[PDB]
Amino acid sequence: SMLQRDFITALPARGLDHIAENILSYLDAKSLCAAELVCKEWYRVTSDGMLWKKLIERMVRTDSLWRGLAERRGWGQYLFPPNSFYRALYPKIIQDIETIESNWRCGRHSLQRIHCRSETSKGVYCLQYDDQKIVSGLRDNTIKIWDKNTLECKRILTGHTGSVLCLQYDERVIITGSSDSTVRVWDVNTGEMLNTLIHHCEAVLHLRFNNGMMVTCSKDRSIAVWDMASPTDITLRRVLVGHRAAVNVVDFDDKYIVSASGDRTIKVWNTSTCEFVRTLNGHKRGIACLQYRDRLVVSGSSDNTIRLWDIECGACLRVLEGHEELVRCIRFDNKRIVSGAYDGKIKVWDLVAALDPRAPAGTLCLRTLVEHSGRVFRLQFDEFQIVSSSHDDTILIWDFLN
């Protein structure tokens, strides 16, 4: 048993280059650069092994930011060109990510404004977008589907007798709740109204569906859990009561169903059994928006504050103060929180700093963006851009990539 061994040299010498390459593929960028400088044979293993191309491919496969950069910048077409190309491309990607982070931190961005040109009652309550389209629910009882690129109105869906308050679409259908107390299911491609659910006695304020089941919540102080075998075969599974005011937002996953209502309480129910689990108290006024994922619950309330809780112990992990008005909509990703207020302002907060109990409160709000003249009703964002719609009948696209 030898005391020392040169794996990266011994393995290729024994026809096992793939094992040495699989070893080196676990390294990071700095460690891979150091391995390039160990000896000539290690450099040869990295070069003939395309370790930089493999590192970029793993970054794309594991990071959504690298995915988006590969899809947008164009260098993703070379993945799946010599090794020096990827070796020189990596630091450019790092610098691009640094510039994007600086743009998010300093408010540097470009803006696209879509005037919905609503005929009568102006306003856009809800939206959801992708790389191709932007589906929005307006106060004129219509659903406007715009092109993500040309910004032109591609489709208009009519059917609701009230304001389309909430929507969600996937690769198959769109599902909308409105002031008419109905839940309408439309085709995402042609726009035909496939189904209507009559259950709630008042306005359906929010809905969510994934993996075959849906949850809706209404002004009638109730939640409804539906099993969806097909877009036309939607069966009501359960009805959840307990809230003492209108349920304004509902979200769920495999574990729990999270609801927020004007009764100043968040309620956590069991997803499988539809059983009440716990009540999160803390907000001094009602809660107008909420997003739940993993263990983190983020909620914006009428007390002009944002609250971050753990879903399992019910503790409030962080209180964010800063909005001068009601926090009407809120969303987060793996890095930052984006919230919109009734005063038209949008605030971008550092999620990692907020979850760190050692960061001061004053440093938590990173940026304040002001381009809306009315109440910000809904927003959705990602690594590069924010998409928001407001009472001013406009839809804004804030692009921080440049």
Partner: peptide, 9 residues
């Protein structure tokens, strides 16, 4: 004084 999307009490 509230939009049709949310309500209180």
């Amino acid at each position: 004084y509230l939009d049709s999307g949310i309500h209180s009490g």
